[PDB]
Amino acid sequence: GSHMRTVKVFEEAWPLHTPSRSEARVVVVELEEEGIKGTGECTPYPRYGESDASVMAQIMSVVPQLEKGLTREELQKILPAGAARNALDCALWDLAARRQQQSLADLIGITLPETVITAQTVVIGTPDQMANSASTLWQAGAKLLKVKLDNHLISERMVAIRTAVPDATLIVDANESWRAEGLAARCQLLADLGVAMLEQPLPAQDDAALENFIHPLPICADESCHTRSNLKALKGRYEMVNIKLDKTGGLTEALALATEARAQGFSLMLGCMLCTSRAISAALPLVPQVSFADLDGPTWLAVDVEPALQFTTGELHL
């Protein structure tokens, strides 16, 4: 009635710098409230049963309701949390801000700093290789390093890295590759090296062992954390939750998750999937609430949208 809109849904596979496999697949949704366009992007999460086809179908399914004026509050009850709702929720926020000639940040009413520290990835390799990489990235300006680890050479790798960048803030993404057996001693080693945080060491569907020992360092939930709904399960297993719009299904849930998570004593982290600047921009409003920001997804793409956000080693310039 009072708000009629047009919806455009299209799929985009952006090439990556180096071998998603060779491309970041995203789904874009453009809304039009007469003259004003609202754009929302999302990245179907394979690990949660989504594909571009799967997510596009969910969006179409609600196109009719989007044209009669579906608000953000109404959208939360129609679609479940996931990439589809994320594109729509973000598209609606973009539209609601442009229709007031304001930046997403001002609409919400939060202040964005001029520079944001983003985690630089130190990929798996021999202790020596990981140490050299950490040193070079530290020299280039990265204050926060995200060390990727599997189940091998955990001690030497972390030792060689810390010795190389004694002043660097380090966080470890074990990415569900670690096991219950010996998990405590390992966390203890990360603590001996001043590791600020350990991320999702165990599989989301088998992380009970995290309640069997006093955590020597904060341990963050990633795959185990989607929406406020998991907060109960997480209590007693994790100190921090990694918030991602594709998992919360939009900025609206992300915001409520931040508030709700804090209230329960959880520390926050802001993550992202492989995406274009459009997705990072949509997440920025959360930056002032998180301990760590891992938003360099766009830098993994050969090219980005135009205009794009400015990224330098370890930094996001706003």
UniProtKB/Swiss-Prot annotation:
Q: Keyword Isomerase, does the record have it?
A: yes
Cofactor(s) it depends on: Mg(2+)
Can you state which reaction this protein catalyses? Answer: L-alanyl-L-glutamate = L-alanyl-D-glutamate
Binding annotation for Mg(2+): 173, 199, 222
Give the pathway listed in the UniProt entry for this protein.
Answer: Cell wall biogenesis; peptidoglycan recycling
Query: Which parts of the sequence bind substrate?
Result: 121, 146, 272, 294, 296
Q: What class of enzyme is it?
A: isomerase
The UniProt entry, under Pfam families, shows: MR_MLE_C, MR_MLE_N
Checking Gene3D superfamilies in the record gives:
Enolase-like C-terminal domain, Enolase-like, N-terminal domain
Can you cite a GO biological process for this protein?
peptidoglycan turnover
UniProt keyword terms in alphabetical order: Cell wall biogenesis/degradation, Isomerase, Magnesium, Metal-binding
Say if the entry is tagged with keyword Ubl conjugation.
Answer: no
Task: Kindly state the subunit structure of this protein.
Answer: Monomer.
The entry's function note states: Catalyzes the epimerization of L-Ala-D-Glu to L-Ala-L-Glu and has a role in the recycling of the murein peptide, of which L-Ala-D-Glu is a component. Is also able to catalyze the reverse reaction and the epimerization of all the L-Ala-X dipeptides, except L-Ala-L-Arg, L-Ala-L-Lys and L-Ala-L-Pro. Is also active with L-Gly-L-Glu, L-Phe-L-Glu, and L-Ser-L-Glu, but not with L-Glu-L-Glu, L-Lys-L-Glu, L-Pro-L-Glu, L-Lys-L-Ala, or D-Ala-D-Ala.
Q: What is this protein called?
A: L-Ala-D/L-Glu epimerase
The species this protein was found in = Escherichia coli (strain K12)
Gene assigned in the entry:
ycjG
